[PDB]
Write a protein that holds these residues in place. Structure first.
Motif, PDB file in Angstrom:
ATOM      1  N   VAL A  19       0.829  -1.212   0.000  1.00 49.03           N
ATOM      2  CA  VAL A  19       0.000   0.000   0.000  1.00 49.03           C
ATOM      3  C   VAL A  19       0.871   1.274   0.000  1.00 49.03           C
ATOM      4  O   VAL A  19       0.333   2.370   0.163  1.00 49.03           O
ATOM      5  N   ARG A  70       0.117  -5.079   5.497  1.00 48.93           N
ATOM      6  CA  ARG A  70      -0.227  -6.226   4.662  1.00 48.93           C
ATOM      7  C   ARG A  70       0.348  -7.554   5.188  1.00 48.93           C
ATOM      8  O   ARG A  70       0.318  -8.551   4.471  1.00 48.93           O
ATOM      9  N   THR A 185      -4.822   7.216   5.498  1.00 48.81           N
ATOM     10  CA  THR A 185      -5.892   6.231   5.181  1.00 48.81           C
ATOM     11  C   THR A 185      -5.929   5.154   6.276  1.00 48.81           C
ATOM     12  O   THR A 185      -4.906   4.997   6.960  1.00 48.81           O
ATOM     13  N   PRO A 186      -7.039   4.401   6.469  1.00 45.53           N
ATOM     14  CA  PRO A 186      -7.105   3.350   7.489  1.00 45.53           C
ATOM     15  C   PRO A 186      -5.904   2.392   7.446  1.00 45.53           C
ATOM     16  O   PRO A 186      -5.494   1.948   8.492  1.00 45.53           O
ATOM     17  N   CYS A 187      -5.379   2.111   6.252  1.00 47.12           N
ATOM     18  CA  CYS A 187      -4.188   1.234   6.129  1.00 47.12           C
ATOM     19  C   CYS A 187      -2.994   1.888   6.834  1.00 47.12           C
ATOM     20  O   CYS A 187      -2.227   1.159   7.487  1.00 47.12           O
ATOM     21  N   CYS A 219     -12.095   5.636   3.622  1.00 51.58           N
ATOM     22  CA  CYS A 219     -11.478   5.302   2.343  1.00 51.58           C
ATOM     23  C   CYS A 219     -12.112   4.087   1.709  1.00 51.58           C
ATOM     24  O   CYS A 219     -12.101   3.010   2.300  1.00 51.58           O
ATOM     25  N   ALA A 220     -12.644   4.247   0.492  1.00 49.54           N
ATOM     26  CA  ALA A 220     -13.239   3.137  -0.241  1.00 49.54           C
ATOM     27  C   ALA A 220     -12.138   2.432  -1.029  1.00 49.54           C
ATOM     28  O   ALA A 220     -12.112   1.206  -1.075  1.00 49.54           O
ATOM     29  N   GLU A 221     -11.223   3.201  -1.640  1.00 52.41           N
ATOM     30  CA  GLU A 221     -10.121   2.637  -2.414  1.00 52.41           C
ATOM     31  C   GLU A 221      -9.217   3.735  -2.964  1.00 52.41           C
ATOM     32  O   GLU A 221      -9.599   4.902  -2.996  1.00 52.41           O
ATOM     33  N   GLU A 222      -8.015   3.353  -3.396  1.00 56.17           N
ATOM     34  CA  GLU A 222      -7.062   4.277  -3.996  1.00 56.17           C
ATOM     35  C   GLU A 222      -6.699   3.738  -5.369  1.00 56.17           C
ATOM     36  O   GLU A 222      -6.779   2.529  -5.614  1.00 56.17           O
ATOM     37  N   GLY A 272      -3.584  -3.691  -3.536  1.00 59.35           N
ATOM     38  CA  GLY A 272      -3.581  -3.709  -2.075  1.00 59.35           C
ATOM     39  C   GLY A 272      -4.892  -3.238  -1.465  1.00 59.35           C
ATOM     40  O   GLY A 272      -5.236  -3.647  -0.354  1.00 59.35           O
ATOM     41  N   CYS A 273      -5.631  -2.374  -2.182  1.00 52.93           N
ATOM     42  CA  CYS A 273      -6.925  -1.866  -1.720  1.00 52.93           C
ATOM     43  C   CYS A 273      -8.011  -2.938  -1.858  1.00 52.93           C
ATOM     44  O   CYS A 273      -8.971  -2.944  -1.087  1.00 52.93           O
ATOM     45  N   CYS A 276      -8.460  -4.826   1.232  1.00 55.95           N
ATOM     46  CA  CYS A 276      -8.632  -3.973   2.436  1.00 55.95           C
ATOM     47  C   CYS A 276     -10.096  -4.002   2.877  1.00 55.95           C
ATOM     48  O   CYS A 276     -10.975  -3.841   2.013  1.00 55.95           O
ATOM     49  N   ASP A 278     -10.967  -2.178   5.915  1.00 57.23           N
ATOM     50  CA  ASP A 278     -11.087  -1.067   6.848  1.00 57.23           C
ATOM     51  C   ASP A 278     -11.584   0.202   6.135  1.00 57.23           C
ATOM     52  O   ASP A 278     -10.838   0.807   5.367  1.00 57.23           O
TER      53      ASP A 278
HETATM   54  S1  SF4 Z   1      -8.664   0.935   0.498  1.00 57.88           S
HETATM   55 FE1  SF4 Z   1      -6.502   1.062  -0.138  1.00 57.88          FE
HETATM   56  S2  SF4 Z   1      -5.843   3.173   0.368  1.00 57.88           S
HETATM   57 FE2  SF4 Z   1      -7.848   2.812   1.421  1.00 57.88          FE
HETATM   58  S3  SF4 Z   1      -7.290   2.221   3.505  1.00 57.88           S
HETATM   59 FE3  SF4 Z   1      -7.457   0.231   2.336  1.00 57.88          FE
HETATM   60  S4  SF4 Z   1      -5.385  -0.140   1.496  1.00 57.88           S
HETATM   61 FE4  SF4 Z   1      -5.388   1.958   2.247  1.00 57.88          FE
END
Ligand code: SF4
Ligand code: FAD
Ligand code: MGD
Ligand code: MGD
Ligand code: SF4
Ligand code: SF4
Ligand code: SF4
Ligand code: SF4
Ligand code: SF4
Ligand code: CL
Ligand code: CL
Ligand code: CL
Ligand code: NA
Ligand code: H2S
Ligand code: W
Ligand code: ZN
Ligand code: ZN
Lengths: 351, 566, 78, 429, 125, 253
Positions: A19, A70, A185-187, A219-222, A272-273, A276, A278
């Motif tokens: 991430v 991760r 971001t939550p990550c 955060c939904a995604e990046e 990586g999103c 996820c 969170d």
């Molecule tokens: S969706 Fe992607 S950018 Fe957002 S918190 Fe999860 S890993 Fe991080």
């Protein structure tokens, strides 16, 4: 079994799920890891010299692997401490009263306002925020002035390694940084608690021991760094970004809005999103998002005692305006949270 | 000081005395040509005189015996006897306490007994118990079958390095000979496995059990040791293992002995002469082993005779102990010895009409009766595995009486007669051959006959057994009950010219001695060997090398035999 | 050797975990000869307490993370 | 001078790699010893001379012969003498204690009665599947600390044999292993483990019974929760046990002194036996004192039992009838000798109230709680510091304790030899 | 007063001065009771304040101390004469007293701990 | 019939082993011969007369011999050990091993009995009107078999390890039973009218009936369909299944 940086390469970096948070670079006691092109790199020549003259320093260390968001926690202590750091909070909606922030903020400008107060009050010496260059490529910085905070207000949907400005703990101590607050971001907030949850973490010389306040964004995604260029966007005319049901909405100087559909954004989502789960960050002192609150207002989830203290200070000093979140908004937040959990479980089993 | 035994019939096989009426004269603990008129006299008229009993394979001291004693308070309680003005209290039957170990051997007419297995790391415990065993002279065989340093030297084909380690290991443990138990199996047991045969590679060492046996036999001969290698073969207690036992003996035909003796002694062959492929078709193959022995003069064996009743199996064969304990639902003691060997203790009860026990009981007798040479099959019960040594008179009477064997066979299952050939054996061993199987052969295989044991020639130790039996008036075939009682309660047991027991009762408790071999090797062999052993002590062993070897304080009355490279 | 220093607090109980896991100590143990009384160990226990040799200590995170008593700590005073 | 290969005289780990610096017959430095060992080896203020309590109720100095003669008279004139302790002295002295017990027709009990005695009772039911500590050091990829806190009780166990050491089959050490702790509270041992199974007090027999059922594929008889622990957690523990290459259970007072007593260890011995049908597994009791194991070894090879009552001139063994606290709670002891043990500080109050009413002989180098109840006090030279002796490590390996400094105090062997001679004169032997 | 289950056992400081039982170091290491955060808060007292631990077999006064690893209802007294003043003396048919898992109660007290010699004097006649 | 009345004439605190107090040994003997019977007061080998006043009435066979102990004897052990016939009536408490290894006859204890009461019983009858301590009808350390026959009835409560390693016979406890009754039961029938916990650990065969509450069950039993024993509904279980056992455990519903 853990194998430090070699484990991160095989199971995260080369696996394609990194991430790009930079936490591994910020924890290494031998400064082996550094962020390059938002990708973790190791100084192999330095590692070989240390190992040839002083031995296998990574063998019983594995601090980088235990800090990576991760890498699944495996030891009892880290799991116990992380559970204690998971906190539910009160959902409210807030908006700034300072016009210079509202002119650049994404929603209510609660993040910029909170960080402004923490600096003006002397509660913190610096804050990690996400600035951006001319092509809107994020630039993480450790800010200490209002000008730098205003230049970071707003939301960018590509990666901003929050830990890159904190890879030199010596220099931070030399510059007088004793207390720092961070937004991420939550990550990135989960990564902060992963390092703090390591056994004897408080006895390591790391920036995680001086971070006093942590804001976690919803955060939904990046998307990958290629998104802007490949999608053929006149960046010079871009004023801001915002992802919603209709897709990525690119506000332009003319007042017009180029809308990219979520169907076209699928190829740009970071790998990586996809795993996820969170959405609200239960690990942050205060979590801030857009959903659940009216446009122009920020949804705030005050979770920890320090979050409650700072939140009340902003209210007592008329720095923010607050309102209740209706049942419709509360359910919409929980729905988006379960949505991410379901899609993460599906994508994890898929592999 | 002086003792004269007169008018007795002497049976001394070492010196070829076949029941001659001759007097035995002793002065200062040694047999002499003549004594003075003031000598004490024992009139042995109508009695049989033999050398003091010698037991070359018994579990009399060490961790395995003490584990058996601790886990079996029920056994301890079964053989309790109060203290007397002459003796300390007694306990146990299969695992007697140190005091009763010595008293019961003395009462039976035995003056010397050797520990079948000494682990090197825990040899101090064995010698500590030896110091508390009264009367008898003692010794022990050191374990080397699954030793890391042995397997390393075997892989490198460095016999000079192996001989240096065996000589060092015998000095460290204060041992007498080389004991090999399930070679490679103890190491394989480190991860819960076992070697499947002679050519099954050992995990992590890249050597085979066969390679370990031949290399240790070669090292044993390079060191000119008094005894040959003592071997407990692979695949013990498994139907069809008679082929592995014979194959192992065949592979040793090409090894030349350094002295006039066997190149290998295979112990308790009762458990290694099994036929069939499973317990259903299990049968005795003593006939196959005896046939091979009748044409092979380089091997000696002991019966490991089974005795119906209570027993406590104890051996360095960890895999078979766990397997047998699971089969019986019995108590299971295990003791892995880091870098050296395995250990297992399992209580057992042999019962008549249990077809497997009936066939096992016949194997020992078949091996002795079908092997022509009486010197080739020693009388043992692998005490207390086959049965407690106090049961040796039962075995003697069975070997001398085809009538007693017939009466005992009638108490067993019909399947025994279909899976054994003992019912058709009429051979009966005479008094002279019993002297061979109970003392002369034991001393000969160990090389102790040249150090004053197992014989009554001038210069030997004054160890004598006088049995109240007239060989001219008693038919040992018909009067087997009288033979058993005579061997159970000797009229006199004499240790070093001193009467120590009379008719099963202790009269004196002198202290015995510990026999061990100090083998010397060229300094270069040891230097090369110490490069590897020091590394093992620095990285893998859990104790310091300076605290590993047994000190002189644990061997207060030694008889050091000198041996080594020519 | 480094800008920082690894030290041992009085909470140390001389468990020897640090002396066993140290990369410097392990490398010395692999030499032709090794004497724990004379080897230049980065961390070793004497009188029930551990002590660091700053001349050879890498100031890595090995002994810090593995110390069960939380007695090992890093120090840096600008 | 530096004395190498010295042996610690404190815990069952019996560390034999200590180096001791001696200057002017005083120990200055102790290398590699943990705090517990270093404190014992460095010493404290000791009993300067023998003493006998007078009518005034005060301990007056006396000669060694006067104290020994008073001890012999007390013991020879008793019908139910108890000789307790032994765990902190050598096997040579323990042997003399057993001989003295026989001559006086007394009961000789080790600290095992209040420690791993229940483990021996369980071993007498099922047998002990164990291994020497070097075996687990070189092969154990799974280590469970059940009811033991080695971080505080056996400080160097983890660094010397159980976890951080690199083995022949474990090239990295701790990273090649998974350690678990089962306890009722989160101890320092549990905090550093891969997994901590917090169980309810006195529930071990149920937990082990359920784990064994799951190992044997009989999970259907195991309920959803066993003593507050979910069945799924017990299934995960069973999975770790059956999936390892070499497992080892290291257990302590949490099983021997908790509810069910020896029943806790025998179910664990059955679990280890059953586990050997799936993978290699062993178990070891974390023995307390540096020589508690030694007494059980000597007493067993000389009498047939780990502890013994020799009242009728023949060994009699039965914990629950002839153990120190059994006899004291029944108030049937008429005289006692406390040697290399502190009964006053480590027995329940009810037992002390009865022990305080009988003539008591104390053989110990330091003043402690027992000294407050002692009628005769005899200072002794310390084994492993002032005199040689044999001791048994927790895994049954015997080592010879080393003499580090010279002393003018009498060793336990010598004090007991003198008591035996005097008692024999009184008895007419 | 609060209901608790007493556990007794080893501590590094208790073992470090086990052969120096008449010293203040031994008294400080063994005359103490470790309790969890919930029980200490419910007691309404600070660390170092004296408490009376009582069982059906005896009672002892010792300073209180915090142990975050102790769950609610679990108190720990290091092995020694103070702990052995409240343990179960029954030998459970095998010579083993009840050293771990003794039901009892904990409560604040104005009384003061007794030194080792005074405690042993209570068992004498 | 022959009646021997032993009246305690002392109260020593030291345990006295008196395995010689049996109708088998007392049968046909004079008062003086009974007084000279050996007893062990700790390490002191002495005579029965030193601890009891002996009164004799008649001379018959062991079967027709009755011994009456007038008073509590809480420190006299092994009373009635190995007896094959006759009666022993104890008018009070008794120490350990009462009726140990007894093969026949009857022993009635009016008071409480200490540990190992009726251990290794092969036959006969043992009645305890008061309570019993540990190892009631159990065996000796390390023995695979304890009680093999006979009947023990305790009217009060019994402590832990009731019927440990039982192989036959019957044990009836009218009160409550301590921890783990019926350990490794292999043919015995145990009845507890009161409460108990963790019964039948490693049972291979036999029957355990509890009419009271079982606080905790060992997680090794397979519950079966409820069964009525003489009209009373009982919860039925089979085990120990982990030990390959098929014994039955009945707990009243
Ligand atoms: S969706 Fe992607 S950018 Fe957002 S918190 Fe999860 S890993 Fe991080
Ligand atoms: C990638 C991404 C996805 C998001 N998805 C959602 C969503 O699905 N639903 C939702 O309700 N809210 C989402 N948000 C949060 C939302 O867009 C706002 O940032 C939030 O409401 C705070 O607004 P504000 O006006 O109160 O704070 P502001 O005053 O506007 O400041 C926002 C802060 O976020 C920081 N920041 C901006 N971009 C990044 C980045 N890429 N990485 C790290 N920090 C950054 C800035 O430095 C600044 O300090 C997302 C944010 C990001 C960065
Ligand atoms: N510092 C110090 N060290 C010593 C000693 C000393 O006095 N002081 N003495 C030595 C001796 S003699 C011995 S025997 C060893 C003993 O060492 P240990 O065996 O570790 O003994 P303890 O620390 O008393 O208790 C062990 C653990 O059992 C746990 N426990 C309590 N009840 C239960 C239960 O119901 N179930 C389970 N699973 N666990 C429970 C306790 O919380 C404790 O952490 O220590 C030796 N080392
Ligand atoms: N509440 C509670 N009570 C307990 C326990 C518990 O967990 N909780 N645990 C129990 C257990 S397991 C045990 S073993 C006991 C503790 O067992 P103890 O033996 O009572 O432990 P220590 O207090 O160390 O006593 C050892 C004594 O031996 C002396 N000593 C040392 N070396 C020598 C020597 O060479 N010769 C002689 N003659 N003496 C020497 C020391 O000075 C010291 O006084 O406590 C028991 N009591
Ligand atoms: S294991 Fe430690 S030293 Fe090695 S790279 Fe990771 S954080 Fe750096
Ligand atoms: S910590 Fe962050 S930057 Fe480092 S490997 Fe893990 S996800 Fe990538
Ligand atoms: S610093 Fe920590 S690991 Fe090292 S000896 Fe001390 S307590 Fe043990
Ligand atoms: S910081 Fe690293 S090099 Fe230094 S003592 Fe610790 S483990 Fe050894
Ligand atoms: S672990 Fe035990 S034997 Fe080793 S130094 Fe520490 S106190 Fe001594
Ligand atoms: Cl000689
Ligand atoms: Cl330091
Ligand atoms: Cl009747
Ligand atoms: Na800046
Ligand atoms: S102990
Ligand atoms: W202990
Ligand atoms: Zn064998
Ligand atoms: Zn053998």
């Amino acid at each position: 079994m853990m194998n430090g940086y070699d484990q991160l390469v095989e199971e995260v970096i080369d696996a394609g799920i990194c991430v790009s948070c930079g936490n591994c670079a910020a924890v290494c006691p031998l400064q082996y890891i550094s962020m390059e092109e938002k990708k973790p790199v190791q100084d192999r020549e330095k590692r070989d010299e240390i190992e040839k003259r002083s031995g296998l320093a990574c063998n019983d260390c594995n601090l980088c692997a235990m800090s990576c968001p991760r890498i699944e926690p495996t030891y009892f202590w880290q799991k116990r401490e992380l559970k204690r750091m998971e906190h539910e909070g009160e959902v409210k909606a807030a908006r700034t009263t300072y016009k210079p922030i509202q002119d650049v903020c994404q929603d209510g400008g609660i993040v910029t306002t909170l960080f402004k107060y923490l600096l003006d009050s002397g509660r913190v010496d610096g804050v990690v925020v996400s600035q951006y260059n001319g092509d809107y490529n994020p630039v993480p910085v450790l800010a200490k002035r209002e000008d730098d905070l205003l230049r970071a207000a707003g939301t960018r949907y590509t990666v901003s390694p929050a830990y890159s400005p904190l890879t030199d703990i010596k220099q931070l101590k030399d510059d007088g940084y004793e207390r720092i607050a961070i937004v991420g971001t939550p990550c990135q907030i989960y990564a902060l608690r992963k390092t703090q949850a390591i056994y004897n973490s408080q006895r390591l010389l790391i920036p995680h021991n001086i971070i006093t306040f942590a804001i976690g964004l919803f955060c939904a995604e990046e998307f990958d760094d290629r998104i802007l260029q490949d999608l053929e966007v006149d960046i010079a005319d871009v004023t801001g970004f915002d992802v919603k049901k209709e897709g990525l909405i690119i506000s332009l100087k003319s007042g017009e809005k180029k809308i990219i559909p979520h169907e076209d954004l699928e190829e740009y989502v970071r790998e990586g999103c996809k795993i996820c789960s969170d959405f609200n960050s239960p690990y942050a002192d205060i979590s801030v998002g857009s959903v659940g609150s009216p446009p122009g207002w920020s949804t705030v989830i005050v979770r920890t005692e320090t979050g409650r203290e700072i939140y009340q200070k902003l209210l007592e000093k008329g720095l923010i305006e607050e309102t209740t979140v209706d049942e419709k908004g509360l359910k919409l937040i929980d729905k988006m949270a379960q949505k991410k959990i379901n899609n993460a479980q599906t994508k994890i089993k898929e592999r | 000081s002086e003792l004269l035994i007169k008018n007795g019939k002497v049976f001394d096989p070492i010196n070829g005395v076949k029941g001659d009426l001759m007097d035995i004269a002793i002065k200062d603990g040694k047999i002499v040509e003549s004594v003075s008129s003031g000598a004490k006299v024992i009139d042995a008229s109508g009695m049989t005189v033999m050398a003091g009993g010698v037991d070359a394979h018994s579990h009399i001291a060490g961790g395995k015996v003490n584990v058996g004693r601790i886990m079996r308070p029920d056994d301890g309680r079964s053989g309790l006897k109060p203290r007397t003005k002459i003796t300390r209290p007694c306990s146990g039957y299969t695992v007697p306490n140190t005091f009763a170990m010595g008293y019961r051997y003395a009462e039976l007419g035995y003056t010397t007994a050797f520990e079948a297995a000494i682990p090197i790391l825990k040899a101090r415990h064995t010698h500590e118990e030896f110091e508390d065993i009264p009367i008898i002279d003692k010794g022990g065989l050191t374990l080397f079958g699954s030793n890391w340093q042995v397997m390393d030297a075997v892989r490198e084909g460095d016999l000079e390095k192996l001989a240096a380690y065996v000589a060092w290991g015998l000095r460290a443990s204060r041992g007498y000979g080389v004991k090999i138990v399930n070679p490679g199996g103890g190491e394989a047991w480190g991860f819960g496995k076992n070697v499947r045969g002679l050519d099954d590679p050992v995990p992590g060492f890249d050597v085979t059990p066969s390679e370990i046996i031949l290399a240790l036999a070669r090292a044993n001969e390079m060191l000119n040791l008094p005894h040959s290698i003592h071997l407990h073969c692979n695949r013990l207690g498994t139907p069809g293992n008679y082929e592995t036992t014979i194959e192992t003996m065949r592979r040793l035909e090409k090894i030349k002995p350094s002295r006039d003796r066997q190149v290998v002694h295979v112990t308790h062959v009762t458990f290694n002469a099994w036929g069939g492929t499973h317990f259903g078709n299990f049968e005795s193959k003593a006939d196959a082993v005896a046939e091979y022995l009748n044409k092979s003069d380089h091997v000696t064996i002991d019966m490991g005779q089974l005795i119906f009743g209570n027993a406590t199996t104890m051996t360095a064969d960890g895999p078979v102990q766990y397997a047998n304990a699971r089969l019986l639902g019995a108590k299971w003691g295990n003791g892995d010895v880091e870098l050296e060997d395995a250990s297992g203790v399992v209580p057992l009860f042999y019962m008549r009409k249990m077809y497997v026990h009936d066939i096992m009981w016949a194997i020992g007798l078949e091996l002795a009766l079908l092997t022509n040479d009486p010197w080739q099959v020693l009388l043992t019960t692998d005490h207390p595995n086959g049965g407690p040594f106090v049961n040796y008179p039962e075995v003697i009477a069975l070997l001398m009486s085809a009538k007693k064997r017939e009466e005992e066979i009638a108490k067993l299952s019909d399947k025994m007669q279909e899976r054994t050939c003992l019912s058709g054996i009429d051979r009966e061993f005479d008094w002279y051959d019993i002297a061979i199987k109970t003392r002369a052969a034991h001393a000969k295989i160990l090389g102790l006959h040249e150090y004053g044991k197992g014989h009554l020639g001038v210069g030997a130790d004054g160890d004598v057994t006088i049995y109240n039996i007239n060989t001219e008036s008693v038919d040992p075939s018909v009067e087997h009950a009288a033979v058993k009682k005579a061997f159970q309660l000797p009229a006199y047991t004499i240790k070093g010219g001193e009467i120590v027991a009379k008719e099963g009762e202790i009269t004196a408790t002198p202290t015995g001695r510990t026999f061990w071999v100090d083998a010397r090797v060229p300094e270069e062999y040891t230097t090369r060997m110490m490069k590897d052993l020091e590394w093992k002590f620095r990285k893998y062993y859990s104790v310091k090398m300076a605290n590993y070897m047994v000190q002189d304080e644990y061997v207060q009355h030694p008889v050091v035999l000198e041996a080594g490279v020519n | 050797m480094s800008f920082k220093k690894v030290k041992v607090s009085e909470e140390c109980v001389g468990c020897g975990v640090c002396e066993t896991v140290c990369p410097v100590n392990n490398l010395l143990e692999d030499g032709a000869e090794f004497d724990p009384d004379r080897a230049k160990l980065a961390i070793k226990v004497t009188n029930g307490e551990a002590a660091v040799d700053e001349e050879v200590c890498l100031t890595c995170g090995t002994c810090t993370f593995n110390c069960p008593s939380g007695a090992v700590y890093a120090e840096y005073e600008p | 001078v530096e004395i190498t290969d010295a042996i610690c005289s404190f815990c069952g780990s019996l560390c034999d790699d200590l180096t001791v610096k001696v200057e002017d017959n005083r120990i200055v430095d102790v290398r590699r010893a943990c705090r517990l060992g270093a404190k014992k080896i460095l010493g404290h203020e000791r009993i300067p001379a023998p003493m006998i309590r007078d009518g005034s109720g005060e301990l007056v100095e006396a000669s060694y012969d006067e104290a020994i003669d008073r001890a012999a008279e007390i013991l020879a004139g008793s019908k139910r003498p108890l000789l307790y302790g032994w765990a902190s002295t050598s096997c040579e002295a323990q042997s003399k204690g057993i001989l003295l017990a026989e001559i006086i027709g007394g009961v000789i009990d080790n600290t095992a009665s209040v420690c791993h005695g229940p483990s021996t009772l369980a071993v007498q039911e099922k047998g002990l599947p164990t291994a020497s500590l070097g075996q687990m050091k070189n092969r154990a990829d799974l280590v469970i600390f059940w009811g033991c806190n080695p971080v505080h009780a056996h400080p160097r166990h983890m660094s010397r044999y159980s976890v951080y050491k690199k083995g022949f089959f474990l090239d990295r050490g701790r990273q090649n292993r998974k350690f678990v702790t089962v306890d009722v509270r989160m101890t320092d041992t549990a905090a550093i483990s891969d997994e901590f199974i917090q169980i309810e007090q006195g529930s071990d027999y149920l937990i082990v019974s359920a784990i064994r059922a799951l190992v044997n594929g009989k999970g259907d008889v195991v309920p959803e929760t066993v003593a507050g622990v979910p069945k799924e957690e017990l299934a995960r523990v069973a999975e770790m046990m059956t999936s390892c290459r070499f497992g080892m259970i290291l257990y302590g007072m949490g099983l021997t002194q908790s509810r069910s007593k020896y029943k806790n260890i025998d179910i664990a011995l059955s679990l280890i036996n059953d586990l050997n049908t799936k993978t290699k597994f062993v178990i070891t009791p974390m023995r307390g004192h540096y020589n508690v194991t030694g007494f059980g070894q000597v007493c067993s090879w000389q009498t047939g039992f780990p502890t013994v009552d020799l009242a009728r001139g023949v060994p009699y063994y039965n914990p629950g009838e002839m153990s120190a606290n059994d006899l004291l709670m029944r108030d049937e002891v008429d005289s006692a000798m406390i040697i290399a043990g502190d009964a006053g500080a480590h027995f329940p109050a009810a037992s002390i109230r009865n022990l305080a009413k009988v003539p008591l002989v104390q053989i110990d180098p330091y003043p402690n709680a027992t000294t407050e109840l002692a009628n005769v006090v005899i200072p002794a030279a310390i084994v492993g510091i002032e005199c040689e002796g044999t001791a048994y490590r927790m895994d049954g390996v015997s080592l010879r304790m080393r003499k580090l400094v010279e002393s003018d105090y009498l060793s336990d062997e010598e004090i007991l030899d003198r008591i035996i001679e005097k008692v024999r004169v009184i008895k007419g032997e | 007063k609060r209901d608790v289950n007493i556990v007794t056992g080893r501590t590094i400081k208790q073992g470090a001065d086990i052969e120096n039982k008449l010293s203040r170091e031994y008294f400080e290491a063994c005359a103490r009771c470790e309790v969890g955060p919930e029980d200490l808060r419910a007691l309404g007292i600070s660390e170092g304040s004296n408490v009376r631990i009582s069982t059906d077999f005896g009672s002892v006064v010792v300073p209180v101390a915090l142990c975050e690893g102790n769950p609610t209802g679990i108190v720990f007294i290091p092995m020694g004469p103070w702990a052995n003043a409240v343990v179960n003396p029954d030998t459970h048919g095998c010579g083993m007293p009840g050293f771990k898992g003794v039901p009892g109660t904990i409560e604040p007290t104005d009384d003061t701990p007794l030194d080792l010699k005074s405690l042993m004097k209570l068992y004498k006649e | 019939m022959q009646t021997v009345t032993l009246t305690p004439r002392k109260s020593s605190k030291i345990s006295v082993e008196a395995e010689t107090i049996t109708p088998d040994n007392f049968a046909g003997k004079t008062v003086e011969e009974i007084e000279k019977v050996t007893v062990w007061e700790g390490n002191n080998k002495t005579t029965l007369g030193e601890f009891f006043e002996v009164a004799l009435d008649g001379s018959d066979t062991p079967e027709n011999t009755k011994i009456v102990i007038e008073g509590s004897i809480p420190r006299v052990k092994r009373v009635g050990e190995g007896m094959s016939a006759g009666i022993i009536l104890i008018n009070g408490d008794v120490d350990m091993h009462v009726g140990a290894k007894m093969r026949g006859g009857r022993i009635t204890v009016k008071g409480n009995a200490d540990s190992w009461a009726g251990r290794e019983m092969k036959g006969g009858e043992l009645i305890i009107e008061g309570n019993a301590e540990y190892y009631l009808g159990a065996g000796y350390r390390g023995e695979s078999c304890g009680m093999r026959g006979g009947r023990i009835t305790v009217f009060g409560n019994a402590r832990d390890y009731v019927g440990e390693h039982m192989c036959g016979g019957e044990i009836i406890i009218k009160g409550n039973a301590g921890l783990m009754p019926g350990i490794s039961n292999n043919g015995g029938k145990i009845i507890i009218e009161g409460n108990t916990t963790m019964p039948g650990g490693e049972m291979k065969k036999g029957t355990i009936i509890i009419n009271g509450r079982v606080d905790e069950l060992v997680p090794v039993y397979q519950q079966e369909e409820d069964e009525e024993l003489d009209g009373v509904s009982y919860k039925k279980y089979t085990g120990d299944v982990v030990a390959g056992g098929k014994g039955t455990l009945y707990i009243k519903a």
